[PDB]
Every structure is written in C-alpha cells, then in structure tokens.
Amino acid sequence: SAPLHLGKCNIAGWLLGNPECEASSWSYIVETSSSNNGTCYPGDFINYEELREQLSSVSSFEKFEIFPKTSSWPNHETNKGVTAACPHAGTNSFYKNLIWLVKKENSYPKINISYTNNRGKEVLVLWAIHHPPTSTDQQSLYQNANSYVFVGSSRYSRKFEPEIATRPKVRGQAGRMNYYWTLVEPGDKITFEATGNLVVPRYAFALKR
Numbered sequence: 105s106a107p108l109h110l111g112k113c114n115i116a117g118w119l120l121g122n123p124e125c126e127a128s129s130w131s132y133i134v135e136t137s138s139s140n141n142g143t144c145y146p147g148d149f150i151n152y153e154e155l156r157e158q159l160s161s162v163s164s165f166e167k168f169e170i171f172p173k174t175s176s177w178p179n180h181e182t183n184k185g186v187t188a189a190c191p192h193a194g195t196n197s198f199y200k201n202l203i204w205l206v207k208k209e210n211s212y213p214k215i216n217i218s219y220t221n222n223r224g225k226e227v228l229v230l231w232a233i234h235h236p237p238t239s240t241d242q243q244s245l246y247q248n249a250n251s252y253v254f255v256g257s258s259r260y261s262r263k264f265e266p267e268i269a270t271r272p273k274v275r276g277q278a279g280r281m282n283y284y285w286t287l288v289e290p291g292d293k294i295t296f297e298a299t300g301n302l303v304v305p306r307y308a309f310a311l312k313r
Contacts, residue, residue: 109134113141115156116149119230120283121200121307123192131161144190144199146274147232147281155285158228162311170219170229170308173203177304180215181208185303189275201307202232207247215302218295219288225310227288231255231296232303237270237278242300251300257293260286266301 108130110118115133117125124141133156143149173182185204186196198204205215221227233253236242242249253264262284270278281303288294296302 105131107132107134109136110139112139114139115159116143116152116283117141119155119228119309120202123190123197123200126192126200128165129163130165133160143283144275145187145232145281146189146271146277146279147235147283149283151285152283158287158313159311162313164225164310164312166310167201167307168310170227170305171217173306176217177203177205177215179208179211179213181206187277189277199303201230201305202303203306204234204303206245210247212247212251212300215296215298215304217304218293219305219308220293221288221290223310224290225312226290228285228309228311229288229294229305230283230285230308231305232281232283233264233266234281234301234303235267235269235279236301237268239268241279242266242268246300248300251298253300253302254295254297255284255286256295257286257288259289259292260294264301 106129108127113125122141122144182203184206186198188196190198
C-alpha cells in the first residue's frame with residue numbers, strides 16, 4: 105500500500121523541511137499520536153487541512169529545486185536567515201525547502217521571479233510571509249519600511265501587506281510567519297514579486313495523484 109510514515113514529524117514539518125525532519129508514492133500517510141516536530145517558527149499554516157487532503161495519496165512525488173539557491177537571488181542575502189526557533193543539532197537554522205531572504209549591503213532591491221511548469225505534472229509550491237515585531241527588525245532584515253509581496257498564477261492571486269506587530273513570545277519569537285501553498289498546473293507560470301518579507305521557495309514538489 106506504500107504507507108508513508110513521517111516519523112516524529114508531521115506533514116507541515118516534512119514539506120517545509122524543518123531541519124529535525126531531515127518518498128515517491130504512497131496510498132496513505134500514517135497518522136501518529138507522538139510526533140513532536142511541526143512548524144518551528146510561530147505563524148499560521150494557511151489552508152493546512154486542504155493540503156493534507158490533497159496529499160492524502162499520490163502516485164508520483166518528486167522534490168526539485170524550483171529556485172536554485174545560488175543563482176536565483178544575486179542581489180539579496182541567502183545565508184543569514186536562521187533562527188534559534190528552528191535549530192539543527194543545536195545550531196540556529198531554518199526550513200530547508202525555503203530561504204529566509206534578507207537585505208544585502210543595506211539594500212533590498214525588488215524581486216520579480218517566475219517559475220513556468222514544464223513538467224507535465226502539478227507542482228506544489230510553498231512559501232511564507234514574515235511579520236516582524238518591530239520597525240527595527242523590519243529595517244534590519246529588509247531595509248524598506250513599507251513592503252509588499254505578490255504571488256500570482258492562473259489559479260492563485262494574493263497581495264500581502266506585511267504587518268509590524270509585537271506578539272507573545274513563542275519559541276523565542278515575537279514575530280510570525282504565515283505559510284502558504286498553491287498547485288501550479290502544467291504549462292502555467294507562478295510569479296513572486298516582493299520588496300521585503302518573503303520567505304522564498306527553494307524546493308517544490310512535482311506530483312500526480
């Protein structure tokens with residue numbers, strides 16, 4: 105039946121790449137009562153239950169590097185987005201399938217990048233939107249005070265206006281990042297535009313039910 109057992113992780117931690125969570129087909133995902141690794145940065149996983157339904161069984165699943173880390177972001181910083189909320193063997197780390205992009209040399213140029221699905225299968229893309237707790241953090245991370253993020257395909261369209269809001273400390277963090285996903289149909293294009301606050305895809309998933 106090719107059960108998929110995720111060990112001590114849940115679907116969110118596995119797909120985002122929680123470093124503590126470090127399969128090509130399955131008829132069901134084993135549900136346990138003792139998994140203790142999920143999302144490590146506080147924030148809401150939007151439409152998580154719908155994603156679990158979409159992934160309940162898949163006949164083909166392949167992770168691929170949708171936006172290669174070393175070539176996709178030449179004017180942004182790719183190696184500083186780590187946090188004690190997402191440890192990896194005690195070190196500050198982060199989700200392995202996303203990159204927490206930050207400013208480079210006191211500048212955050214506009215991002216405008218697209219992926220066109222040439223795979224003949226649906227592509228599942230995940231990203232996150234960071235809401236810092238203070239204007240100090242907004243400036244430290246992204247330079248620009250008033251940013252936006254747009255994500256659009258033929259099926260999905262949303263403009264995000266990141267907020268500055270001090271929230272209760274969770275895993276040391278008074279900010280939040282909300283997690284998002286969409287399925288990109290074969291032949292379609294997904295575009296990401298941003299002037300700050302975008303936790304970009306690095307790895308995405310080609311799949312067939």
